[PDB]
Write an enzyme that holds these catalytic residues in place. Structure first.
Site, short mmCIF file in Angstrom:
data_model
loop_
_atom_site.label_atom_id
_atom_site.label_comp_id
_atom_site.label_asym_id
_atom_site.label_seq_id
_atom_site.Cartn_x
_atom_site.Cartn_y
_atom_site.Cartn_z
N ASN A 190 1.13 0.49 54.45
CA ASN A 190 -0.27 0.64 54.89
C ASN A 190 -1.24 1.01 53.75
OD1 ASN A 190 1.13 2.49 57.67
ND2 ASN A 190 0.76 0.28 57.60
N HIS A 192 -1.08 3.58 51.73
CA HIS A 192 -1.21 5.03 51.61
C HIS A 192 -0.14 5.52 50.64
CE1 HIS A 192 -3.99 5.87 54.93
NE2 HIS A 192 -3.54 4.71 55.41
N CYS A 227 -3.89 11.98 48.96
CA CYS A 227 -4.37 11.46 47.69
C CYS A 227 -4.65 9.98 47.92
CB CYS A 227 -3.36 11.67 46.56
SG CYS A 227 -3.76 10.75 45.02
#
Ligand SMILES: COCC(=O)NCc1ccccc1
Ligand SMILES: COCC(=O)NCc1ccccc1
Ligand SMILES: COCC(=O)NCc1ccccc1
Ligand SMILES: COCC(=O)NCc1ccccc1
Lengths: 268, 269
Positions: A190, A192, A227
């Site tokens: 995704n 991330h 992050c």
């Protein structure tokens, strides 16, 4: 891998790979953490949970709701060597409106001895607003049928290391590794940053002398903020003592906290 | 995994993991490269090669001699999806006094169709002086008994992509990713940067627009110099071209000392 006889837990065996080991020819804590993640994902898939978002249902996908890790705690007694087979058992348990808990037990396949254990806390949140949300009874009922009803704890001790509050590291840090940036291999499907990359970043500020003369026994890590793939991170460490350290990951500019944790190391 | 019936090649199956896939839910080129490395290491172990240094013998360890990758070339037709099983066959062949060649064929376990292929060139070097040296007959004889004697090529074509000379990228680069540093997960058991990390660093300078609209088909990478665990790298890319082609350069962030050069070929999704 497979669900156990009662269908309330999942087991999988892994052969430790050549690129998965450190200087001691045994698996790194990031290899262990990747395997806990893999068996966690296989358990969710085995009972019909979404392939687009971890542990989500059609109900959650419509509401744009996801599960996020709040805390990970891992304790290793023996790291498996390259070529060894490790068997991992995992299960989930509800923790009321707060969220959920996923636990793991690591075993040596040959001897059957417990070589490690882990516990993680998960919270629900809207994937767009990033706002934490209380788990509704509709969402709760969906996963409760896949959890044992009596308490099954990997860390049963009343007031153990996995539930200790972690303080914020004060400047100046004793050690630091700055300018840490994620590359594409650090991202998940995704886009991330993978939860395991944060464990690596925390450990980047441990001096090489510690890594060479000690083995990591316990790591506790709080996940406060994500992050982004274009953020830069600074990893800070201070000795608090076996050796013990306090850790802080923050954004390189404004110093916004992303994670905090503690590590405990044993002399080789 | 296991050596095949004739003992001259090795096969292994892998189930693609959840953290091994990209945005397409299919394995990344770095996951593929890690699996080629894993099956290469299992093949060497299966026939008694050293567990301290890849493909070394007692004779080589005594002389402080190692094998190093000079070039890696990978071509992928279909990337396996998360949960899929990929079967990989690998074998090694001598290339005279220059060194050796290790080849791979990737297959879909269910259909049996070839979904990829790879070829790599290895050279012998003293591990302390870093000086390349020709392979002696003593070292040669030790590994020849584990190689087929008739030519078995993953890229048989006489003038093919795997043997093309790669030019040096000229400044200014069209794209760049600066300040790349290895972390402990990028190091191998001997504290050296893993060969696969360099593939990742090369790809860091490809724009996200290319990655989102194309799939990587071919990557060729020359290994000129090793990045130390405390070095910083700059990754540079320029388009050289339906299909997209790029020229790549990895160099040290300070003095600009070349560590790798390569080319990539991308096909529109
Ligand atoms: C998709 O993740 C599934 C899972 O069970 N993750 C375990 C984990 C959480 C945090 C750090 C490392 C590992
Ligand atoms: C977010 O909560 C952690 C989790 O893994 N939930 C899904 C699940 C629960 C029970 C069995 C299998 C999968
Ligand atoms: C120790 O490595 C064994 C091996 O066969 N490695 C193949 C490889 C070479 C370069 C890049 C990626 C993979
Ligand atoms: C350095 O050359 C590549 C290589 O893998 N050599 C060792 C080997 C040769 C033949 C069969 C198995 C292992």
């Amino acid at each position: 891998g497979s669900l156990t006889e009662d269908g309330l837990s999942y087991k999988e065996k892994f052969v430790v790979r050549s690129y998965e080991v450190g200087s001691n020819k045994t698996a790194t804590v990031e290899t262990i953490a990747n395997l806990l993640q893999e068996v966690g994902c296989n358990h969710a898939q085995s009972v019909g949970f979404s392939t687009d978002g971890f542990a989500t249902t059609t109900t959650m996908r419509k509401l744009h709701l996801i599960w996020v890790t709040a805390r990970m705690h891992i304790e290793i007694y023996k790291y498996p060597a390259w070529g060894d087979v490790v068997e991992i058992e995992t299960w989930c348990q509800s923790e009321g409106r707060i969220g959920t808990r996923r636990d793991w037990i690591l075993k040596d396949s040959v001897t059957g001895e417990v070589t490690g254990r882990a516990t993680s806390k998960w919270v629900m949140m809207n994937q767009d607003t990033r706002r934490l949300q209380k788990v509704s009874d509709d969402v709760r009922d969906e996963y409760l049928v896949f959890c044992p009803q009596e308490p099954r704890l990997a860390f049963p001790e009343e007031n153990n290391r996995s539930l200790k509050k972690i303080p914020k590291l004060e400047d100046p840090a004793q050690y630091s590794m700055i300018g840490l940036k994620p590359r594409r291999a650090d991202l998940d499907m995704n886009q991330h940053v993978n939860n395991v990359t944060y464990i690596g970043w925390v450990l980047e500020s441990i001096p090489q002398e510690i890594v060479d003369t000690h083995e990591l026994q316990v790591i506790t890590l709080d996940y406060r903020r994500e992050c982004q793939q274009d953020d830069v991170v600074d990893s800070l460490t201070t000795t608090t003592s076996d050796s013990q350290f306090l850790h802080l990951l923050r954004l390189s500019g404004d110093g916004q906290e992303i994670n905090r944790g503690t590590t405990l190391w044993r002399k080789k």
